[PDB]
Write the structure tokens for this entry.
Amino acid sequence: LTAYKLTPSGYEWGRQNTDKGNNPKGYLPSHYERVQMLLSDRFLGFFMVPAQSSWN
Amino acid sequence: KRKYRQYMNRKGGFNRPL
Amino acid sequence: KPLPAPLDGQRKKRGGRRYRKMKERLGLTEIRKQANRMSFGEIEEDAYQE
Amino acid sequence: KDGYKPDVKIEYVDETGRKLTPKEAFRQLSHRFHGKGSGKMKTERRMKKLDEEALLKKM
Amino acid sequence: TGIFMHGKIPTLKISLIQIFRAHLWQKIHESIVMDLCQVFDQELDALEIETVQKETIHPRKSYKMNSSCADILLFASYKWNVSRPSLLADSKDVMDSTTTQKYWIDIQLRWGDYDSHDIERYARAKFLDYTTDNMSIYPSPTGVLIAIDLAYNLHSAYGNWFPGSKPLIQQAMAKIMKANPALYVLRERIRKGLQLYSSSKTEWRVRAISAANLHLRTNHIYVSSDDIKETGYTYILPKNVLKK
Amino acid sequence: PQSDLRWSKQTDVGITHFRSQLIPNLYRYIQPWESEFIDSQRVWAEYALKRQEAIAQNRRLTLEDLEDSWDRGIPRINTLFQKDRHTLAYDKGWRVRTDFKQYQ
């Protein structure tokens, strides 16, 4: 597992870009920034699934 | 032809004979 | 004992006969190939296994 | 240029007319350059080898 | 020998002496000059050459680098118009407005190191040096100098050329690098010294099976905790949600 | 130096010259210990699941089904394929023996 956060410059580049290619223009290494992520066993999580159809 | 002129024990001039 | 005076006589005058058993004891016919060879081009086993 | 295809062919031969191996040609050249030929025993061995080769090639 | 020893390396001195034993340099030069004379005699009348000449050569000439001399002299029945100097690979040559009757050919053997293994530069420099030298006497101002690198097996000529000599010299050099006896002996001695001799149909089932064993993958979860800014909010995602 | 990267080759057409930096360092080619250990843990968990599923199918793991895990793991997925495997199972105390070998 790994966490990732988008910089405002990265968010602007993603919003401006619309091509869905393998290496689209405007993608930069500074667009994404990893953030600290720690698992825990103290609080249980909740799961939500669509009422009509399945998530798959 | 294929003549091979002498180098050793000539006793003459240093330069090769014609 | 004093070290014997070094000398170099004729290494061998005749061959065959017993001479062959002599080498057989030490110097027998080994593979004599691909053991003292280096294979200039490629690499056998790992690169720096040694 | 003038325009031609010169057939520059260089071969090593002996007084007997047989083509010589490069080692034999080099030996002949060195013998002629040093001014001294082979000894009597070497000459006899070479003559015997040539006679044996001629006999073998005749059948 | 024509080899220069940069640095007192007795090991290399002994090795080179072993390789060039029994005046091998002089024998190599002699073999080359005789082979070239034989080639020229075999193609004598085709290029209007009256005859060839065996110049009296001092033994040291083979390994004389400071000065030089003549090796082969060509005599003509008719005038040879000569061209300006060009390399062995110079397909296009500019003709010089002069003629000659006697034409000299010189053979220089060199043992080039790594930095000076360019045969063309050496041939050009030595041709422009010996011709305008005072201790080197040439029969005619016009001629050709062929430099041969034994250490790298190269050859190049830069002198003055006449029509019809270009291909003859080219195939002569080719055949003399291919089948010279003395050169073959040099190569064999070098080899001996070096001791070197010659679908969605079956993929669905695979996916289902892999997902069946994906439960065990949740028992080992790793987090890439690196390059964290340590300034933003942290993530406290629970283990149960991640397992689900 | 670039001066040592030039080389010549001669053909009948003439002589042609060619060119090609820093010497690679050893530390670039040796995996770090921490990466080695995490890799070993994950690869041996993978081998455990592969072995149990092969037993479920009543078959023996081949070289190809584990070639993805070749040269990964502190023991050696590779060693799992050595012939002496059965013999080496009784060679207990071998690390201490190798350490004490300096006295013999």
